[PDB]
Scaffold this active site. Structure first.
Site, PDB file in Angstrom:
ATOM      1  N   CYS A  90       0.860  -1.170   0.000  1.00 48.16           N
ATOM      2  CA  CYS A  90       0.000   0.000   0.000  1.00 48.16           C
ATOM      3  C   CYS A  90       0.900   1.225   0.000  1.00 48.16           C
ATOM      4  CB  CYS A  90      -0.929   0.012   1.215  1.00 48.16           C
ATOM      5  SG  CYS A  90      -2.454   0.974   0.929  1.00 48.16           S
ATOM      6  N   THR A  91       0.297   2.405  -0.046  1.00 46.62           N
ATOM      7  CA  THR A  91       1.072   3.636  -0.055  1.00 46.62           C
ATOM      8  C   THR A  91       1.986   3.669   1.161  1.00 46.62           C
ATOM      9  OG1 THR A  91      -0.723   4.741  -1.200  1.00 46.62           O
ATOM     10  CG2 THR A  91       0.926   6.141  -0.144  1.00 46.62           C
ATOM     11  N   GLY A  92       1.452   3.244   2.299  1.00 41.27           N
ATOM     12  CA  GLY A  92       2.237   3.199   3.518  1.00 41.27           C
ATOM     13  C   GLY A  92       2.115   1.823   4.141  1.00 41.27           C
ATOM     14  N   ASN A  93       2.659   1.649   5.341  1.00 41.72           N
ATOM     15  CA  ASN A  93       2.551   0.370   6.031  1.00 41.72           C
ATOM     16  C   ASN A  93       2.139   0.682   7.461  1.00 41.72           C
ATOM     17  OD1 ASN A  93       2.653  -2.458   6.069  1.00 41.72           O
ATOM     18  ND2 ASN A  93       4.756  -2.497   6.857  1.00 41.72           N
ATOM     19  N   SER A  94       1.014   1.382   7.583  1.00 41.25           N
ATOM     20  CA  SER A  94       0.485   1.790   8.879  1.00 41.25           C
ATOM     21  C   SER A  94      -0.924   1.297   9.202  1.00 41.25           C
ATOM     22  CB  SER A  94       0.487   3.314   8.980  1.00 41.25           C
ATOM     23  OG  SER A  94       1.785   3.841   8.780  1.00 41.25           O
ATOM     24  N   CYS A  95      -1.829   1.361   8.224  1.00 41.43           N
ATOM     25  CA  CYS A  95      -3.220   0.959   8.445  1.00 41.43           C
ATOM     26  C   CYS A  95      -3.725  -0.230   7.623  1.00 41.43           C
ATOM     27  CB  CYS A  95      -4.153   2.149   8.191  1.00 41.43           C
ATOM     28  SG  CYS A  95      -3.941   3.572   9.292  1.00 41.43           S
ATOM     29  N   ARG A  96      -4.132   0.044   6.385  1.00 41.70           N
ATOM     30  CA  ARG A  96      -4.667  -0.985   5.494  1.00 41.70           C
ATOM     31  C   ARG A  96      -3.765  -2.199   5.298  1.00 41.70           C
ATOM     32  NH1 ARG A  96      -5.743   3.444   0.931  1.00 41.70           N
ATOM     33  NH2 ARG A  96      -3.761   4.060   1.916  1.00 41.70           N
ATOM     34  N   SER A  97      -2.503  -1.957   4.960  1.00 42.69           N
ATOM     35  CA  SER A  97      -1.561  -3.047   4.736  1.00 42.69           C
ATOM     36  C   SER A  97      -1.296  -3.864   6.003  1.00 42.69           C
ATOM     37  CB  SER A  97      -0.252  -2.497   4.171  1.00 42.69           C
ATOM     38  OG  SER A  97       0.237  -1.448   4.983  1.00 42.69           O
TER      39      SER A  97
ATOM     40  N   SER B 108       3.822  -7.608   4.334  1.00 46.20           N
ATOM     41  CA  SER B 108       3.109  -6.381   4.009  1.00 46.20           C
ATOM     42  C   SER B 108       4.159  -5.286   4.051  1.00 46.20           C
ATOM     43  CB  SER B 108       1.965  -6.094   4.997  1.00 46.20           C
ATOM     44  OG  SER B 108       2.402  -5.407   6.153  1.00 46.20           O
TER      45      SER B 108
ATOM     46  N   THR C   3       5.950  -5.216  12.134  1.00 42.57           N
ATOM     47  CA  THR C   3       6.810  -4.079  11.845  1.00 42.57           C
ATOM     48  C   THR C   3       6.314  -3.297  10.635  1.00 42.57           C
ATOM     49  OG1 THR C   3       8.315  -5.487  10.542  1.00 42.57           O
ATOM     50  CG2 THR C   3       8.863  -5.139  12.866  1.00 42.57           C
TER      51      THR C   3
ATOM     52  N   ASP D 285       7.351  -1.849   7.344  1.00 39.02           N
ATOM     53  CA  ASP D 285       8.428  -2.021   6.379  1.00 39.02           C
ATOM     54  C   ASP D 285       8.251  -1.360   5.018  1.00 39.02           C
ATOM     55  OD1 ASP D 285       9.441  -3.920   8.369  1.00 39.02           O
ATOM     56  OD2 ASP D 285       7.943  -5.307   7.554  1.00 39.02           O
TER      57      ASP D 285
ATOM     58  N   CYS E 140      -4.733  -0.150  -2.874  1.00 36.85           N
ATOM     59  CA  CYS E 140      -5.362   1.083  -3.331  1.00 36.85           C
ATOM     60  C   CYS E 140      -4.765   1.451  -4.679  1.00 36.85           C
ATOM     61  CB  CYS E 140      -5.184   2.222  -2.315  1.00 36.85           C
ATOM     62  SG  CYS E 140      -3.577   3.008  -2.252  1.00 36.85           S
TER      63      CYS E 140
ATOM     64  N   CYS F 106       3.583   0.332  -7.614  1.00 34.18           N
ATOM     65  CA  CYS F 106       4.138  -1.004  -7.444  1.00 34.18           C
ATOM     66  C   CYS F 106       5.177  -1.235  -8.531  1.00 34.18           C
ATOM     67  CB  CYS F 106       3.041  -2.061  -7.545  1.00 34.18           C
ATOM     68  SG  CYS F 106       3.639  -3.722  -7.181  1.00 34.18           S
TER      69      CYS F 106
ATOM     70  N   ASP G 288      -8.555   4.981   2.798  1.00 31.49           N
ATOM     71  CA  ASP G 288      -7.565   5.243   3.836  1.00 31.49           C
ATOM     72  C   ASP G 288      -8.291   5.789   5.068  1.00 31.49           C
ATOM     73  OD1 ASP G 288      -5.490   6.010   5.432  1.00 31.49           O
ATOM     74  OD2 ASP G 288      -4.552   7.364   3.974  1.00 31.49           O
TER      75      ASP G 288
END
Length: 137
Positions: free
Chosen positions: A8-15, A34, A61, A63, A80, A87, A103
């Site tokens: 995902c765009t980040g690795n904080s919520c969805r991922s 993830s 973690t 990543d 997303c 990607c 998000d």
């Protein structure tokens, strides 16, 4: 035996929630990863949301994308449209699947609406993983 890589765009919520759901739905045959284009740490609301359904992702973690792992995956799942755009190129043998979830961190509204948003996205991701676990998508 099999490797699934969520991006995902980040690795904080969805991922992170996808990683948590995948480890619950997929048996000891699948290795789950993830990552994000950027990694700024676990989102507390996501951790709480998963805890609410009996899944602990507090030890996961945050990543950044690693091509050494991605290129060896059976499939990469972007979460997303932005992630799909960013990607990187993968070997022809890696299946590129694209799902889409809002998000929860960018949601604007009352605090109760925003918390409900985190729970809703959590449920959508879980139900999508249920589909994958049953059909292989």
């Amino acid at each position: 035996n099999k490797i699934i890589y969520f991006l995902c765009t980040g690795n904080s919520c969805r991922s992170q929630m996808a990683e948590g759901w995948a480890k619950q739905y997929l048996g000891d045959e699948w290795k789950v990863y993830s990552a994000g284009i950027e990694a700024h740490g676990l989102n507390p609301n996501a951790v709480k949301a998963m805890k609410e359904v009996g899944i602990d992702i507090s030890n996961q973690t945050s990543d950044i994308i690693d091509s050494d792992i991605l290129n060896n995956a059976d499939l990469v799942v972007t979460l997303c449209g932005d992630a799909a755009d960013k990607c990187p190129m993968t070997p022809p043998h890696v299946k590129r699947e694209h799902w889409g979830f809002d998000d929860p961190a960018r949601a604007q509204g009352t605090e109760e609406e925003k918390w409900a948003f985190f729970q809703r996205v959590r449920d959508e991701i879980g139900n999508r993983l249920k589909e994958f676990a049953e059909t292989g998508k």
